């Protein structure tokens, strides 16, 4: 009896217990069977695994492990192109130099044969869609026109599985992807927490069997505290853990002692950024935090918490859309960030004009589209648009804007992700009237008016909070504000505070109030 | 021969591998003139090896011109009889037509996707052995499949079959051993349906209406029936009549009425061979030129069939339209408005829908004049109509139904569904007493 | 490798000159896996060789096949545990996160216009060779030079 796999207990993998089972049944069940029933069946073996996903998610690992540890052969591997050559025909010929040790082998051993494997990698480089390839005719066209000719070729070789892998699967030709040339198109993606901890269990098992690790590390906490890590990142987390321990442990004068890993995640999660959320993106936009000056802030961020809980819980509203109106210099983005920071959804990338400058609207809308397509990977997410009227160019005078970015924006607001996923799209603006005029406002599912500070009462209690002005001088500002109304927003306030502060103390408050006369007026 | 397999670097070896092909078949011609054993050649993926001589971009080599040797060999000065040669190509249009003219290659035959009933032959021809050796239950219905596969072709048809045998094995297949059990009694039974759903993509995707249809269709009164009847009375226009091979419909209504959703409903109810939804969702950031080319390609492949339907959703977004000031892209408009009144060749029937939230923009752009007809989608106008709708939905119990029902009928409602869902939802999330009060208070401002 | 040396008019030679680098290390890793010595590689300019391959910067970047080959080579199906590649940019943002992610290049560092202490140490370095031979001992205030020089590089 011939079985190509004597042992795999578990190999180098966690989180994929679905995907490995699917790929296994599809492409190794025909292999592992009684032959008699399969020739009763009259079925031809599936070949042609493809693996498409984002980077750092463990695809070439999988291909490596199956090919070289699961079944008995040595696989021929092309690293990117190895193929291409300066001479015509020899590039193409290297393809058949791959297949020409298994073709005759099948010819002269019949059905039963030792399996041959080919692992392509970065296959999108060698193969791309014809007619759009490097000009009209294309340079890369005959390698692919041979490859298709061989894989399903007239010889009907039955003895190979081709394992491709990509980060850009749309490039790959449907002609090559139809069943039998590559049968299985398999997404592998950012793991869920239980798979995520499996990763850590694996990479820490060899460290755990030995007692170097310290008892204070419960990896479930680490699962909670790295949400989206691909696992290529996660090894790096562990790897730099070991490194910090070693440096703690030591011209060089390495002092020879026995060492223990501890506080890895706590120390260096702050170091490494990720494909998913950051802790640090927030402190840019909220530098001062959010001080509570009244019931308005309660109302606003409670509505936000309420709404994210709606999205999390409910179905038949896969997406929601909100925007925050305020007058200018009434913080919109602070609220919009703190909402997400309290929502604890796993994926947040703010889309802001500030990181896009000088960009023509084409590459602009491609960027926002990239963000939303990244977000559609995860199971749920919160995306912030801010300063919309500057995101899409806007001026009142002879009114002008980019049409393209507008339409891309609001179709995305009206767009649904693949089912089961859920998100909210938060937006900000200082004006919603022009948005009514361009009829994108209806697309936003709901709005929140952010009020602006209306009362010297709210002002002076905010100043109790900030603590910049003490009570003695504040007695004067009380007598100034009482009975009068104020329109100023706090982001302008927080300028006025220091603008007055830098004067001498005697003229301090007099300048402050005489200045504040201008805006309240 | 595989397609480039001829090609080699040394300047004359490319042609000198072709003459190897035809030397036998001309030598036996010479020796025996009248007859021979019919040495036949099979080219494969011929489009690469032979394409038009006058394009060198990317090649920078003369070896694009092996073709001259080829066709100067095939008929040549020396006629060669008792040879057969067959080309095979995905891409038909790049071939130098010097060898498409009759007598070098006679026939241009185009194999299209399988027809619905021929697909049954395609299915039964594979399952013959599976049934003859009694690995097939009598419950599975190949016809139930064959109607349930819209665009499955060939390998795509065989993929569910091959997968089904695998999924049926895998149970009996099963750690360190990974034992293969001995049990040989099995058959895949109604797991081909499951795999038909999940595992392959069709390769031409209409499978997902879900993004368009979240809730199906709540049948909420007489108007929805009136609409669906007008539509399925209109669909018969194509199928019956050959003097109106093209028909064109508008769906006119206010926003948030699910017009583009029930368009998909009527499409799937028409059950045509080729159906499509041209979305602005799929096309984003595309400049007006590419936005025209995509639509162009859609209608072009739709013409291939003996009939088709296509819907165009949110044309006001598709051709980018904003007032503040009139502004839009014109080329997409021109393309669309030509295509409405482009009659397909020789009664290959077409149906078109478009949807808008605005007719007042369109009647000056002269688009609905081009459309054959238009049908209105009225949206819910009253408390009774609304209450029937939400009791079809659920998610208000009888006390809440009444609690609303007291004070609705005295009032007049202008609402639409796509808003109503969000209203009931966000009001619902609040605590139980608060739920209906909030729903109400939202409706106070929204429907007024 | 100093900037591109690689890029060649002909197809495939621009990937041959790339894998030329690492083939010297591959053989050694295979012969001795465990205890082999490092082959360090030093890219003076990364950004010119590899810029984003995402069908951006024109058609498929510029000759993005190079970066395909590279990120296939260093993190490829062979382990290749025996090298670290140095890379250096004054234009970092172009580079693909696929390449910068942990394991192909884990560590991205910023070096920035130094504070007074660094701007002292660097001066003391460039001056110690010359003082040790007692050429200048004259009334030269180093702290004063440093604090006079605000941002210099």
């Amino acid at each position: 009896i011939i079985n190509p796999d004597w042992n795999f207990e578990k190999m180098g993998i966690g989180g994929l217990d679905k995907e490995f089972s699917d790929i296994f049944r599809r492409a190794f069940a025909s292999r592992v069977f009684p032959p008699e029933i399969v020739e009763q069946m009259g079925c031809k073996h599936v070949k042609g695994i493809l693996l498409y996903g984002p980077p750092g998610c463990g695809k070439t690992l999988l291909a490596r492990q199956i090919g070289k540890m699961l079944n008995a052969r040595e696989p021929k591997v092309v690293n990117g192109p190895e193929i291409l050559n300066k001479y015509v025909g020899e590039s193409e010929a290297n393809i058949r130099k791959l297949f020409a040790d298994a073709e005759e082998e099948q010819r002269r051993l019949g059905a039963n044969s030792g399996l041959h494997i080919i692992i392509f990698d970065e296959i999108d480089a060698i193969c791309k869609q014809r007619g759009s390839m490097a000009g009209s005719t294309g340079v890369h066209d005959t390698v692919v026109n041979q490859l298709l000719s061989k894989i399903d070729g007239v010889e009907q070789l039955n003895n190979i599985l081709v394992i491709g892998m990509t980060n850009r699967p749309d490039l790959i030709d449907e002609a090559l992807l139809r069943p039998g040339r590559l049968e299985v198109k398999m997404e592998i993606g950012l793991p869920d927490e239980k798979g995520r901890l499996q990763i850590l269990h694996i990479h820490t098992a060899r460290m755990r069997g030995h007692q170097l690790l310290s008892a204070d590390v419960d990896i479930k906490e680490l699962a909670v505290e790295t949400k989206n890590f691909s696992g290529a990142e996660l090894e790096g987390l562990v790897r730099a853990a070991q490194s910090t321990a070693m440096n703690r442990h030591i011209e060089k004068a390495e002092s020879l002692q026995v060492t223990r890993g501890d506080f890895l995640a706590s120390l260096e999660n702050d170091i490494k950024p990720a494909f998913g959320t950051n802790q640090e993106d927030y402190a840019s936009y909220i530098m001062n935090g959010i001080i509570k000056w009244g019931d308005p802030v309660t109302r606003v961020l409670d509505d936000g918490e309420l709404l994210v809980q709606q999205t999390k819980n409910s179905d038949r509203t896969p997406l929601v859309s909100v925007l925050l109106e305020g007058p200018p210099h009434s913080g919109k983005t602070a609220l919009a960030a703190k909402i997400a920071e309290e929502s604890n959804f796993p994926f947040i990338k703010i889309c802001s004009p500030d990181k896009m400058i000088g960009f023509s609207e084409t590459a602009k809308c491609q960027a926002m589209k990239k963000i939303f397509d990244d977000a559609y990977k995860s199971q749920l997410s919160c995306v912030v648009v801010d300063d919309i009227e500057r995101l899409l160019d806007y001026v009142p005078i002879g009114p002008r804007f980019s049409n393209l970015v507008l339409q891309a924006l609001l179709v995305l607001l009206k767009k649904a992700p693949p089912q089961g996923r859920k998100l909210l799209i938060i937006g900000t603006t200082s004006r919603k009237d022009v948005l009514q005029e361009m009829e994108m406002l209806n697309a936003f599912s709901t709005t929140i008016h952010v009020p602006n500070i209306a009362t010297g009462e709210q002002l002076l209690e905010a100043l109790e909070l900030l603590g910049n002005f003490k009570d003695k001088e504040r007695t004067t500002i009380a007598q100034q504000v009482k009975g009068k109304k104020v329109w100023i927003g706090i982001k302008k306030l927080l300028m006025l505070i220091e603008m007055s502060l830098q004067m001498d103390p005697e003229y301090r408050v007099r300048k402050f109030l005489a200045l504040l006369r201008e805006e309240g007026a | 021969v595989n397609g480039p397999e001829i090609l080699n670097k040394y300047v004359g070896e490319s042609e000198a591998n072709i003459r190897k092909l035809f030397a036998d078949a001309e030598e036996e011609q010479r020796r025996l003139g009248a007859n021979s054993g019919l040495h036949i050649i099979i080219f494969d993926e011929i489009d690469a090896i032979c394409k038009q001589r006058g394009s060198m971009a990317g090649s920078t080599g003369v070896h694009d011109t092996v073709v001259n040797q080829l066709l100067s060999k095939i008929d040549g000065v020396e006629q060669l009889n008792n040879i057969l040669v067959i080309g095979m190509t995905n891409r038909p249009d790049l071939i130098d037509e010097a060898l498409l003219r009759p007598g070098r290659l006679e026939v241009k035959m185009e194999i299209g996707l399988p027809d619905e009933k021929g697909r049954l032959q395609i299915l039964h021809i594979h399952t013959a052995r599976m049934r003859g050796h009694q690995l097939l239950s009598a419950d599975v219905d190949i016809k139930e499949l064959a109607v349930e596969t819209k665009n499955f072709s060939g390998a795509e048809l065989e993929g569910l079959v091959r997968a089904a045998q695998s999924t049926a094995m895998n149970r009996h297949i099963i750690v360190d051993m990974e034992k293969a059990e001995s049990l040989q009694v099995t058959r895949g039974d109604f797991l081909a349906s499951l795999e038909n759903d999940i595992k392959p993509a069709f390769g031409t995707n209409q499978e997902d209406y879900a993004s368009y249809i979240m809730n199906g269709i709540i049948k909420w009164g007489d108007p929805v029936t009136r609409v669906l009847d007008d539509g399925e009375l209109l669909v018969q226009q194509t199928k019956n009549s050959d003097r109106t091979p093209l028909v064109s419909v508008l769906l006119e209504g206010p926003p948030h009425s699910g017009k583009t959703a029930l368009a998909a409903k009527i499409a799937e109810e028409s059950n045509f061979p080729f159906i499509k939804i041209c979305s602005p969702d799929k096309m984003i950031g595309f400049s007006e030129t590419a936005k025209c080319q995509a639509m162009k390609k859609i209608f072009d492949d739709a013409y291939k069939s003996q009939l088709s339907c296509v819907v165009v959703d949110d044309i006001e977004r598709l051709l980018d339209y904003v007032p503040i000031g009139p502004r839009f892209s014109n080329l997409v408009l021109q393309a669309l408005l030509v295509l409405l009144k482009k009659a397909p060749p020789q009664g290959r029937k077409l149906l078109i829908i478009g949807t808008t939230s605005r007719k007042d923009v369109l009647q000056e752009m002269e688009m609905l004049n081009a459309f054959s007809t238009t049908i209105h989608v009225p949206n819910i106008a009253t408390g009774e109509q609304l209450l029937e709708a939400l009791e079809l939905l659920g998610n208000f119990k009888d006390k809440e139904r009444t609690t609303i029902a007291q004070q609705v009928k005295g009032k007049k409602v202008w609402i639409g569904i796509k808003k109503l869902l969000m209203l009931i939802e966000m009001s619902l999330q609040m605590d139980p007493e608060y739920r209906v009060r909030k729903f109400l208070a939202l409706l106070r401002e929204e429907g007024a | 490798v100093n900037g591109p040396e690689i890029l060649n008019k002909y197809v495939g030679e621009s990937e041959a000159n790339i894998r030329k680098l690492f083939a010297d290390a591959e053989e050694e890793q295979r012969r001795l896996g465990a205890n082999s010595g490092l082959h360090i590689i030093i890219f003076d300019e990364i950004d010119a060789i590899c810029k984003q391959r995402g069908s951006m910067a024109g058609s498929t970047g510029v000759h993005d096949t190079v970066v395909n080959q590279l990120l296939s080579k260093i993190d490829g199906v062979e382990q290749l545990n025996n090298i670290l590649v140095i890379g250096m940019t004054n234009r970092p943002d172009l580079i693909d996160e696929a390449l910068l992610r942990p394991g192909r290049l884990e560590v991205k560092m910023e070096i920035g216009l130094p504070d007074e202490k660094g701007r002292l140490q660097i001066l003391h370095i460039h001056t110690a060779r010359m003082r040790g031979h007692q050429l200048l001992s004259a009334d030269v205030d180093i702290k004063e030079l440093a604090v006079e020089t605000k941002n210099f590089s």
């Binding site: 300066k86 001479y87 015509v88 490097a134 340079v139 | 670097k9 040394y10 300047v11 990317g58 090649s59 920078t60 080599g61 070896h63 | 008019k9 002909y10 197809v11 024109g58 058609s59 510029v62 000759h63």
Partner: peptide, 17 residues
């Protein structure tokens, strides 16, 4: 520019018989 041309060329065999 924004020019990528990648090209190939062919051999002229020497006579060593």
């Amino acid at each position: 520019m924004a020019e990528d041309a990648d090209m190939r060329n062919e051999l002229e065999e020497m006579q060593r018989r």
